[PDB]
Write a protein that binds this ligand. Structure first.
Ligand SMILES: O=C(O)CNC(=O)C(=O)O
Ligand SMILES: [Mg+2]
Ligand code: NI
Ligand SMILES: [Zn+2]
Length: 331
């Protein structure tokens, strides 16, 4: 078995190897990369996502989210308070303000210490989930707005034609902006490209050990657990590396820098934080190996997790028994 300790693997494809996206994913899996839940891909030196970032300041963040925490430093939830619209230029200036900027630090490890010590005492503002793309249309390799669609994968594997579309999302981050512990909708893959700015630190649990994280989360968030049988789908709960180590949960960590891709694999729980002003682009995707994960994925039916138009069809075809109750949650 390849990668039996489930370590995060880092790949350096040549420009020749960067042509065929599906084939490279399948290569990484042949080496065991999926066992970690997360992999890093460093693009060939010749590749670029676009020529410059010089003209992005007029993108609008229609609903910036203030991430307010409750709990203790290592075990907390966050809620998202909606703020007034602002441009990317306005948000960058805010991120660089004395109130919101990255503090002085020695290295990534000192910054990680300061994040876990201090996160809960501040409420950073995240421009998340903005439909759009920063890839130039002429970038032919690993262009996240030109991938094969999940609907077309389901049709190729299973023969069934379904409605829905699959488009990318932009994330504008600042110091302390946080992504809670989650897997993807329908336990899909995700791919994330850090276009510019400061790094993003990731934590991940191997897919084969995901249920260990779920059991800890039910113990640590006991009212949330009674409210919903899949409450990590609400994307609100944080648990620190120190707390995971104290409870024997297997995990790994890695820092993504500008110009690098990350891939999350089906049922790979992940969480993390931004080091400073940055912009990432991400999208879900599928392969043949995903289909069985999609059939087994948990679902939120309490009504909190409220998800896309395109997830309807996935539930309806892969989980027809759940269909009914899950759509009661979504209406
Ligand atoms: O970058 C973020 O805030 C969150 N991204 C992801 O969870 C991902 O790409 O799967
Ligand atoms: Mg602009
Ligand atoms: Ni994710
Ligand atoms: Zn729920």
């Amino acid at each position: 078995a390849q990668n039996p300790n489930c370590n995060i693997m880092i790949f350096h494809p040549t420009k020749e190897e960067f042509n065929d996206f599906d084939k490279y994913i399948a290569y990484m899996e042949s080496q065991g990369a999926h066992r970690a839940g997360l992999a890093k891909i460093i693009p060939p030196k010749e590749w670029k996502a676009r020529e410059t970032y010089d003209n992005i300041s007029e993108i609008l963040i229609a609903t910036p989210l203030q991430q307010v925490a409750s709990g203790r430093a290592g075990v907390f939830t966050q809620y998202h308070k909606k703020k007034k619209a602002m441009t990317v230029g306005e948000y960058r200036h805010l991120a660089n303000s004395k109130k919101y900027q990255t503090p002085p630090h020695q290295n990534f490890e000192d910054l990680e210490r300061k994040y876990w010590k201090n996160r809960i005492y501040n409420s950073p503002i995240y421009g998340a989930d903005i439909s759009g793309s920063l890839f130039d249309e002429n970038t032919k390799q690993w262009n996240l707005g030109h991938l094969g669609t999940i609907q077309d994968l389901l049709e190729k594997e299973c023969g069934v034609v379904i409605e829905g579309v699959n488009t990318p999302y932009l994330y504008f981050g600042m110091w302390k902006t946080t992504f809670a512990w989650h897997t993807e909708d329908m336990d899909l893959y995700s791919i994330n490209y850090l276009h510019l700015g400061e790094p993003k630190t990731w934590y991940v649990v191997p897919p084969e050990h995901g249920q260990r994280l779920e059991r800890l989360a039910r113990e640590l968030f006991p009212g949330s657990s009674r409210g919903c049988g899949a409450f990590l789908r609400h994307k609100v709960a944080l648990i620190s590396p120190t707390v995971l180590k104290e409870n024997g949960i297997p995990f790994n960590r890695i820092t993504q820098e500008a110009g690098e891709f990350m891939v999350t694999f089906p049922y790979g729980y992940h969480a993390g934080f931004n080091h400073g002003f940055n912009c990432a682009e991400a999208i879900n995707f599928a392969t043949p190996r995903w289909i069985d994960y999609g059939k087994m994925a948990s679902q939120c039916s309490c009504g909190e997790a409220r998800v896309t138009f395109s997830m309807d069809a996935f539930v309806r075809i892969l989980q027809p028994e759940r269909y009914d109750l899950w759509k009661r949650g979504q209406d």
